[PDB]
Amino acid sequence: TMEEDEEVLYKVRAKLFRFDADAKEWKERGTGDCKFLKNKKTNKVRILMRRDKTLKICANHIIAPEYTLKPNVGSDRSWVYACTADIAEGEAEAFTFAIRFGSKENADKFKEEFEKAQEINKK
Amino acid sequence: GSMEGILDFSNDLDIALLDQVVSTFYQGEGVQQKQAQEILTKFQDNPDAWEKADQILQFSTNPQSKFIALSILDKLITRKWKLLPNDHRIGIRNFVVGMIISMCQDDEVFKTQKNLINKSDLTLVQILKQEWPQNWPEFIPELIGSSSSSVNVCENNMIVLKLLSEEVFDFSAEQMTQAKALHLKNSMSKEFEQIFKLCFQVLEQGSSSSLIVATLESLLRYLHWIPYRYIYETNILELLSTKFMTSPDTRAITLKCLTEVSNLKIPQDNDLIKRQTVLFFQNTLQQIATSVMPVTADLKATYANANGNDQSFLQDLAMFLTTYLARNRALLESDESLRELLLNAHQYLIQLSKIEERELFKTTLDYWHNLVADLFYEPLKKHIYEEICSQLRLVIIENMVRPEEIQLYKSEREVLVYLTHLNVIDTEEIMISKLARQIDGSEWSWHNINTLSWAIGSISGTMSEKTEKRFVVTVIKDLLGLCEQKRGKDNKAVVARDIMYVVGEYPRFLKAHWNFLRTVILKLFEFMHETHEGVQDMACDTFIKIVQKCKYHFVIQQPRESEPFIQTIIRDIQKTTADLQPQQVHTFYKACGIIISEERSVAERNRLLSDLMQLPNMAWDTIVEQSTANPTLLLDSETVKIIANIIKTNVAVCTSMGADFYPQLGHIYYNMLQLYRAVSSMISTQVAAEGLIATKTPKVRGLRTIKKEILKLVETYISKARNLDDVVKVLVEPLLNAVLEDYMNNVPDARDAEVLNCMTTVVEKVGHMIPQGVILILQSVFECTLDMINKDFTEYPEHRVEFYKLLKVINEKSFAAFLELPPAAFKLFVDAICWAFKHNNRDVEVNGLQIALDLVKNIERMGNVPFANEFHKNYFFIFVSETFFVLTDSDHKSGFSKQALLLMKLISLVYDNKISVPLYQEAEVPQGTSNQVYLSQYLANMLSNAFPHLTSEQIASFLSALTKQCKDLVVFKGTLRDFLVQIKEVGGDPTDYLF
Amino acid sequence: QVQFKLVLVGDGGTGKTTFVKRHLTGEFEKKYVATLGVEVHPLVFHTNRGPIKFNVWDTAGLEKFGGLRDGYYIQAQCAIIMFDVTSRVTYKNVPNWHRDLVRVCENIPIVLCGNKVDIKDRKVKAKSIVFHRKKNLQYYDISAKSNYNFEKPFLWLARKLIGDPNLEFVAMPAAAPPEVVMDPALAAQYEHDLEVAQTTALPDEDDDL
Ligand SMILES: Nc1nc2c(ncn2[C@@H]2O[C@H](COP(=O)(O)OP(=O)(O)OP(=O)(O)O)[C@@H](O)[C@H]2O)c(=O)[nH]1
Ligand SMILES: *C[C@H]1C(=O)[C@]23[C@H](O)[C@H]1CC[C@H]2[C@@]12CO[C@]3(O)[C@@H](O)[C@@H]1C(C)(C)CC[C@@H]2O
Ligand SMILES: *C[C@H]1C(=O)[C@]23[C@H](O)[C@H]1CC[C@H]2[C@@]12CO[C@]3(O)[C@@H](O)[C@@H]1C(C)(C)CC[C@@H]2O
Ligand SMILES: *C[C@H]1C(=O)[C@]23[C@H](O)[C@H]1CC[C@H]2[C@@]12CO[C@]3(O)[C@@H](O)[C@@H]1C(C)(C)CC[C@@H]2O
Ligand SMILES: [Cl-]
Ligand SMILES: [Cl-]
Ligand SMILES: [Cl-]
Ligand SMILES: [Cl-]
Ligand SMILES: [Mg+2]
């Protein structure tokens, strides 16, 4: 699985979208458990998200300090941010992601954990 | 590209290039594969491509090229065969027959090219449909002759005959005219004597297993239609039930044949045929016991291991035993020499039932239901099966599913309920002993204890009250032991839920012992405080179900109790519901609503209702005073959430109380419609200020939730109201003022489809009492809603569906409202109905055709008056032709019966002379002409222009038959289906319409 | 690599393309664009017995876009027949799709799939669905929308094709993701894309997740 080297800081149920530019519309990329994983070797924290049942990776990227969480117009329980390099598909690619949670509480908690992970990744 | 050469028909076909393009498609990848696909499609779809088929079959080295060549022939044969000169037809027959014989003679080709030979055989059968037997009389005798010359040819002829039987008997109904179906059935029936002679010879004579398989494959098809005497007055049953069960390559197909043999129509008064039905079963079971596995074999382990075709064979055994025993087990129940054969067969099903396969288990469970129901009602039967029934109790109890899976659970409940009645003592021991196994820990598991709990719940109501009482006490006592045994809150929570589930399922026990019932409710309230969300929702769900079952016990004052317990619940409702989520609170209030509806004293119920709604009414009153103090104080999204939840609490209580809710609706009604207007203004203001995107924001969605829940509350009450005078005099006028103008004057994306839904319910229950009300509803929603849905079939799907629901109920209850329309608006009504016809949306299409039928019926009621005469002259032929368009365009097949029904009604009006005036304008046809004559001339012209490949004779015969059959739906539908077949081909026989 | 040809057949509208797209990309397409002839997509799953690859032949259900029709079934190693539980005509056409399929592929594993079980108003009830029993098809209630049982058809086919009934899907390995090293030249562009994404609403806002 390549997750044994890592400690689970935070785990939350979420749905992930990527913005398609050609058509101006959001497209689902996966639904399942979103995990914040701290590498015990490097102390670097990444987002790893796996789809329900298939267990395929829909999100795999470092929680970069530069990244900023921006609210969607149509959701108080979602965050939209730009990821420079995601390797879920295979080769590092730039995405405009949106991630939606079960409640405003979960989204607010995600925002605090994301910022905690960013401070760790600066060192 | 280079591959596009084959599309150029001005040049002779490069056969070697075709074979590359075909290989690039089947063996290739990426853009190359996709490009090859578009080229092969365009080649195939070329109307002259059939001319190349002879060329390709002779010279191509690629079997897939030859396959697609036969697809192109298949296309020509089914659609344009009769257009060919007779020389070409005999020519094509010869190189198809020649190619089949060629491939059979080459042992390498016959072994390795099965796809191509099967396709050739099917293509030959398509020619037989066209020519045989009128233009090919000696085909069957020729085919029988060719069989003796070669084993490969003999085998391949069994595939030809199999496909021929499939096309004529199994799949003819859809694809041929009734007349052509009958002709081919009769032709095969006359010559089957000779076909069976060959099939019996081959099977009896034997040798090549593949030949035997192909021969047995063909027999499976024959068994669908042939007379019983071919099975019963020959040696063939002995051969199927003995010889062909021993060899495994023929075992699968023989077992499928014997399954179909059990379904053959047979005289019930023949003692010999009965012995023969017993004998083939005895033979088959004997072969299984000695050649495959004994009765004691673990079929669960065998299936799970999944070696070779064990799975398909065990499936086919289950189908055979259940099919046979469901029809014939009565034969085995009288004669005590047959007792062992009956119980062995049932013991095979027991072992099959233990297999871990949901679909296989469902098949066996269907049989077990059939049996135990028979033992429940049939006299002197049950004592035979006591040992089978005891084993089945364990099977069902060990495979019990949760109640959420309704079809399987209800199937299992019903079998286990029957089994409990048949022996209450045995069921008790099995469940108690299984519980003991959980306590000892050998079988202890979360799934096992849960699955046992569902089983114990299922049988509630079957035992005597006194037996149930003791059994329930024992189960609860044992379950409480488990809690003491297992530490850790997770493990305790699993059994705690199970314990609550059981008490939920046994209401009669709760009714009997008030103290126990009271203790359980208080624990649920304690459980509602629990931090874990799972516990809270479990606790809430249990409370509603117990309440539904024992509602009467709450409302009355119990012995040694100060007051009715409902009174006690309402005192502490605030405290009890403090930790629950909104929708869990709504369930609680709904439950209290169920109890309050049992009190039939008007004074005591209205007081209990007032006490129940205390908290939301006080919360409502504060927000009513602060809201009208300044409408800016409604911008707070937290205030929007509390309002929604107050309305939703009112919906929840109204759902369970219906007519009894009216006093509470009275308390909030005028301020609630005021709130509807205030929320409406904010949404319109917000739209202008932020744009269309505004309707997607949490703020506006928040406001729209308030509007929808208000409409839902009003819709819920009026759907269940007793006092309809109070609905009209009090509720309707304020509602229509509040919702209709707001709906009309909002932009499309701000219009709530729930308005249309609410209006439908109003017109349903009080439409006849508010003729002016229905007029007002049409004017407000009709023209502007039609404009939202009349540009495409996709946009505003909810509005689309609720629109035609509303037009349907108005047309049923208050048709007068359509007579009061301006002519231009009535024309839009007819346009709207025909617009519904063309939808693939099943909800819209069905309503569309129903409105049309109800409209024609409404016009007929009016009799000979100006509006009905004007209706028919303006709109009769629009309905006839628009109905014909959707009947014949192949894209609306799901609406076929209602189309037929409407078309039948319209034709009947003319032939019953219910239309008083000429439908034609003067100087279009001779002055004295009947509507009967003009209808057939109009329809002839219409169908001629729409289907120019049909002859005048085809169209004339069709209309002659169809018009005569206007009172006979089943035959009328037959004639329409005959027409749909003939429009797909050229040269349809006009005599087919005389069937 | 260990790869198998899977043909996907059934009436127009049943959800064949939606189902495959959901497996390929994770997206749920709400629009109905009828497939022309066939669409071939590689689909890989990770199992405890290594990776398995399906070449998914997603065929057109509509007669007019039928293309090569039974031409697509040649040398298929397994199949899925799709119908819509909200459309009775799509279940009535299952025997026709099956007939065409087995006339080309005599002995392959086939899943029968009832799609759109998420819709409350179900028109083809569980009781009526029995065609799979005599034809030895595996059956599953599925929903491409709710993802109910959506892994099941591929898991069962994987088990039959490899010939191992203990075969499981497993978590694919998750490599270390790389350092961002953001460049200011494209910073301006990414910002523009971000601005647009914020202003577009996320679909199905009333959904549970
Ligand atoms: N509610 C619901 N809608 C679904 C589901 N699966 C698909 N749909 C929708 O139904 C339609 C199905 O479209 P497709 O998947 O393209 O249909 P198809 O079966 O590939 O059609 P053809 O290519 O014409 O054979 C689309 O509008 C889908 O979004 C489902 O599980 N639930
Ligand atoms: C279907 C073929 C077959 O099995 C035959 C012939 O080839 C043909 C019909 C009759 C069968 C025979 C003659 O040769 C066969 O190959 C063989 O199966 C039969 C034998 C056993 C040789 C004799 C009886 C019958 O005439
Ligand atoms: C097994 C658990 C359980 O169900 C209990 C307790 O939560 C725990 C041990 C004892 C059970 C009770 C008390 O509360 C329970 O939830 C409830 O199921 C039992 C009742 C019926 C309320 C009374 C006896 C026992 O003390
Ligand atoms: C469909 C109509 C029709 O054509 C009928 C009747 O008017 C009605 C049902 C049965 C048809 C008749 C009786 O009168 C009809 O007008 C006439 O077309 C039919 C005749 C030819 C008289 C005899 C058969 C049938 O009873
Ligand atoms: Cl071939
Ligand atoms: Cl006979
Ligand atoms: Cl009661
Ligand atoms: Cl003619
Ligand atoms: Mg498609």
Give dist(CA B694, CA B419) in Å, integer.
61
* Residue type (1 letter), B536: Q
Out of B38, B171, B359, whose CB is closest to C139?
B359
For chain B, the straight-line distance linking the first and the last C-alpha, in angstroms and rounded, comes to 53
* Residue type (1 letter), B928: G
- How many inter-chain contacts (A to B, CB under 8 Å) are there? 10
- Which helix (H) or strand (E) segment is B450 a member of? helix B446-458
What's the number of domains chain C is made of?
A: 1
**Residue C26, burial from CB neighbour count under 10 angstroms (0-12, 13-18, 19+):** buried
Out of C31, C123, C136, whose CB is closest to B312?
C136
Residues of chain C whose beta carbon is less than 8 angstroms from a beta carbon of chain B are: 13, 31, 36-38, 40, 63, 67-71, 74-75, 86-89, 95-96, 99, 103-104, 106, 123, 125-127, 132-134, 136, 138-139, 159-160, 163, 165, 199, 201, 205-206
Per CB-CB distance under 8 Å, the chain B contacts of A107 are: none
Q: C39 lies in which domain range?
A: 1-209
Q: Are B935 and B919 in contact (CB under 8 A)?
A: yes
Three-state SS for B10-60 is CCCCCHHHHHHHHHHHHHCCHHHHHHHHHHHHHHHCCCCHHHHHHHHHHHC
- Tokens representing B225 are 């239609």
Q: List, comma-separated, the residues after which chain C is broken, a break being a C to N distance over 2.5 A; otherwise answer none.
A: none
Chain centre to alpha carbon of residue A34 = 7
- Reference B110, options B95, B125, B100, B119; nearest CA is B100
Instruction: Among C7, C8, C14, C81, name the best residue to mutate to test ligand 1's pocket (greatest count of ligand atoms within 8 A of Cβ).
Output: C14
- Reference B321, options B277, B384, B262, B373; nearest CA is B262
* Residue type (1 letter), C156: W
**Residue B567, burial from CB neighbour count under 10 angstroms (0-12, 13-18, 19+):** middle
Task: Tell me how far CA of residue A52 lies from CA of A93, B405, C111, C152, C171, in angstroms.
Answer: 23, 21, 21, 12, 11
Strand order in A70-71's β-sheet? A57-62, A45-50, A25-39, A6-20, A93-101, A78-86, A70-71
Give dist(CA C204, CA C209) in Å, integer.
9
Which chains have 3+ CB pairs within 8 A of A?
B, C
CA distance A114 to chain C (A): 16
Give dist(CA B452, CA B476) in Å, integer.
13
- Tokens representing B944 are 């001629």
- Tokens representing C176 are 């270390």
Q: Find the farthest-apart pair of alpha carbons in chain A and give their distance in angstroms, rounded.
A: 42
Per CB-CB distance under 8 Å, the chain C contacts of A78 are: 202
Which residue stretches of B862-983 are H helix?
866-888, 896-911, 931-946, 952-964, 969-983
- Reference B975, options B178, B4, B236, B333; nearest CA is B178
Nearest atom in ligand 2 to the alpha carbon of residue B149 is: 7
**Residue B663, burial from CB neighbour count under 10 angstroms (0-12, 13-18, 19+):** middle
Per CB-CB distance under 8 Å, the chain B contacts of A74 are: 693, 696-698, 701
DSSP-assigned beta bridge partners for residue C82: C113
Kindly write down the DSSP assignment for every residue of B466-500, as one continuous string: HHHHHHHHHHHHHHHHHHHH--SHHHHHHHHHHHH
- Tokens representing A97 are 């992601």
Q: Are B182 and B191 in contact (CB under 8 A)?
A: no
Count of CB atoms situated within 10 Å of the CB of B994 = 10
Give dist(CA B188, CA B136) in Å, integer.
13
Show which of residues 16-75 on chain A sit within 8 Å of chain B, judged by CB atoms.
73-75
Out of B305, B406, B893, whose CB is closest to C89?
B893
Q: Are B706 and B672 in contact (CB under 8 A)?
A: no
CA distance C165 to chain B (A): 7
CA distance B693 to chain A (A): 8
Q: Do C177 and A61 touch (CB under 8 A)?
A: yes
CA distance B273 to chain C (A): 26
Show which of residues 569-588 on chain B sit within 8 Å of chain C, judged by CB atoms.
none
* Residue type (1 letter), B885: F
Sign of CA dihedral B867, B870, B872, B877: negative
Q: Whose CA is nearest to atom 12 of ligand 1?
A: C15
Q: Whose CA is nearest to atom 1 of ligand 2?
A: B154
Show which of residues 33-72 on chain C sit within 8 Å of chain A, judged by CB atoms.
45-46
Q: Are C195 and A77 in contact (CB under 8 A)?
A: no
Give dist(CA C127, CA B408) in Å, integer.
10
Which residues are near ligand 3 (CB < 6 Å)? B 480, 483, 492, 495-496, 499, 519-520, 523
The SS3 assignment for B667 reads helix
B186-194: long-range pairs with CB below 8 Å, 24+: B187/B132, B187/B133, B188/B164, B191/B133, B191/B140, B192/B222, B192/B226, B192/B230, B194/B140, B194/B141, B194/B144
Q: Do C194 and A51 touch (CB under 8 A)?
A: no
Q: Are B439 and B481 in contact (CB under 8 A)?
A: yes
Give dist(CA B341, CA A8) in Å, integer.
62
Does the CB atom of residue B396 touch ligand 4 within 6 A?
no
DSSP-assigned beta bridge partners for residue C7: C57, C79
* Neighbour-count burial for B716-733, b at 16+ CB within 10 Å, e otherwise: bbbeebeeeeebbebbbe
Q: Are B804 and B781 in contact (CB under 8 A)?
A: no
Place of tokens 């939703």: B648
B471-478: long-range pairs with CB below 8 Å, 24+: B471/B428, B472/B502, B472/B506, B472/B509, B474/B432, B475/B431, B475/B432, B475/B435, B475/B502, B476/B502, B476/B503, B478/B432, B478/B435, B478/B436, B478/B439
Instruction: Among B523, B524, B546, name the best residue to mutate to test ligand 3's pocket (greatest count of ligand atoms within 8 A of Cβ).
Output: B523
Q: Closest ligand to B950 CA? A: 8
Does the CB atom of residue B154 touch ligand 2 within 6 A?
yes
Enumerate residues with CB within 5 Å of ligand 7 (an ion). Answer: B 551-552
The SS3 assignment for B829 reads helix
* Method by which the coordinates were obtained: X-ray
Phi/psi class of residue C181: alpha, beta or left (left: φ > 0; alpha: ψ in -120 to 50)?
Answer: left
Q: Are B664 and B655 in contact (CB under 8 A)?
A: no
Q: What angle do CA B434, B436, B439 make, to 5 degrees?
A: 120
CB of C151 within 8 Å of a chain A CB? The answer is yes
* Residue type (1 letter), B31: V
CA distance A49 to chain C (A): 10
CB of B37 within 8 Å of a chain C CB? The answer is yes
Q: Are B255 and B317 in contact (CB under 8 A)?
A: yes
Give dist(CA B645, CA B588) in Å, integer.
13
Q: Are B43 and B6 in contact (CB under 8 A)?
A: yes
Give dist(CA B609, CA B595) in Å, integer.
10
Q: Closest ligand to C144 CA? A: 1
Instruction: Among B110, B148, B194, B196, name the best residue to mutate to test ligand 2's pocket (greatest count of ligand atoms within 8 A of Cβ).
Output: B148
